């Protein structure tokens, strides 16, 4: 259990082809911990008179030798090129310290803006919903539904928000996957965990993914709908990308 303080809150676009180079002063042996809140952006890439949706997730985080971090991305089909808009918060374990500036139990009825700005950690218990936090609102959608509609849902969650009043202390980081990973009495982060393209209803249905906490284990499940690009024009191979970037977990103390 450590309390890294703060360095940056970058929300920019990649400078080079799938490369982000946020720079901040660092201390030697600081063991940089970077929490990502926008791992994936769906970018529409043009290909000779064709607008194609394409997820652009992040794969590797590399420290730039005591002068910042760099984020290397990779699109879904590995063919096109673009500049995504990832966004996250950079911390060093070794100068403001983040604090619990909002902690109440709320019910989200489909979409709720953040009462205060920060990195939100939540914890709920429902099996037919999924939660994802794009960049300004907690999005909840019905997950057992299979059709192309954007069906909303209501879940009751315990919301915690940190920013610059217990101090911010984090714990084990979980790599969210397609299998149940038990976390026990702990709060998961809130972010999109990838994207999904499926032949459904005659369209190239594109959705984002999100956490699905049932019992006390988390798992990637389908979420808000991005768009339906018709299959009369072009037909795309299916994909179910799950981002490899870990999600922070904190104990239920706040």
């Amino acid at each position: 259990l450590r309390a890294p303080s703060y360095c940056t809150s970058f929300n920019q676009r990649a400078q080079s082809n799938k490369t982000l180079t946020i720079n901040t002063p660092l201390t030697a042996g600081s063991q940089v911990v970077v929490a990502l809140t926008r791992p994936v952006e769906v970018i529409e890439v043009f290909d000779q008179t064709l607008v194609i949706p394409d997820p652009f997730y992040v794969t590797s985080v590399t420290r730039n030798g005591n002068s910042g971090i760099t984020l290397r991305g990779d699109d879904a089909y590995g063919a096109y090129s673009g500049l995504p808009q990832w966004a996250g918060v950079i911390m060093e374990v070794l100068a403001k310290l983040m604090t619990c500036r909002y902690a109440k139990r709320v019910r989200v009825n489909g979409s709720m803006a953040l009462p205060v700005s920060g990195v939100p950690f939540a914890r709920w218990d429902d099996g037919n919903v999924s939660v994802g936090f794009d960049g300004g609102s907690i999005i909840v959608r019905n997950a057992s539904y299979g059709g192309i509609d954007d069906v909303a849902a209501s879940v009751d969650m315990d919301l915690v928000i940190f920013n610059n009043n217990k101090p911010f202390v984090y714990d084990r980081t979980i790599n969210i996957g397609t299998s149940d990973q038990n976390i026990g009495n702990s709060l998961i982060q809130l972010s999109y965990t990838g994207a999904l393209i499926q032949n459904n209803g005659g369209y190239n249905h594109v959705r984002m993914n999100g956490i699905r906490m049932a019992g006390n284990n988390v798992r990637v499940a389908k979420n808000r709908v991005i768009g339906n690009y018709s299959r009369q024009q072009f037909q795309m191979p299916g994909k179910n990308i799950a981002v490899p970037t870990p999600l922070l977990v904190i104990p239920n103390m706040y």
């Binding site: 000779q48 008179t49 064709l50 024009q233 072009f234 037909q235």
Partner: protein
């Protein structure tokens, strides 16, 4: 081996002036046939103006037909193959009426494009096939001469 260029194996000397009567004389096929005919010396006597004793190319009905010919490994059409049959009948004044035909084959990959841009490609492909089928009708003309001479 000797190659004696050619010996007027163009449109037979008999059919050096004819009338291109056609169901639709303003379509793409009729203009395509006219081009090949003019390039072959044949002057197209104004539509049924002279009294008689001149042949007539009576262009018939065309039939374009696009079908699948190969599939990818996920059962998706890869190659189409267009086929365009174009009929015709030559009237020799008095003697008889002899039939001609044409059959053009074209293959191409199914390129996923827009709808305004995929129409322009399928219009160029059809217009090309009209030129190649009109060419085949200006062959098989040396044939009816040999079938009428016997």
């Amino acid at each position: 081996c000797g190659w004696h260029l050619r010996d007027t194996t163009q449109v037979p000397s008999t059919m050096k002036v004819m009338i291109l009567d056609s169901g639709d004389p303003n379509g793409p096929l009729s203009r395509a046939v006219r081009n090949q005919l003019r390039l072959n010396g044949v002057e197209l006597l104004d539509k049924e103006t002279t009294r008689k004793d001149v042949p007539s190319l009576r262009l018939g009905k065309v039939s374009i037909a696009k079908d699948t010919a190969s599939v990818f490994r996920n059962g998706q059409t890869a190659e189409y193959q267009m086929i365009m049959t174009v009929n015709a009948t030559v009237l020799i004044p008095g003697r008889d009426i002899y039939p001609i035909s044409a059959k053009v084959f074209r293959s191409f990959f199914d390129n996923p494009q827009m709808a305004l841009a995929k129409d322009n490609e399928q219009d160029m492909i059809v217009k090309e096939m009209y030129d190649r089928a009109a060419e085949q009708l200006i062959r098989k003309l040396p044939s009816i001469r040999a079938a009428d001479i016997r």
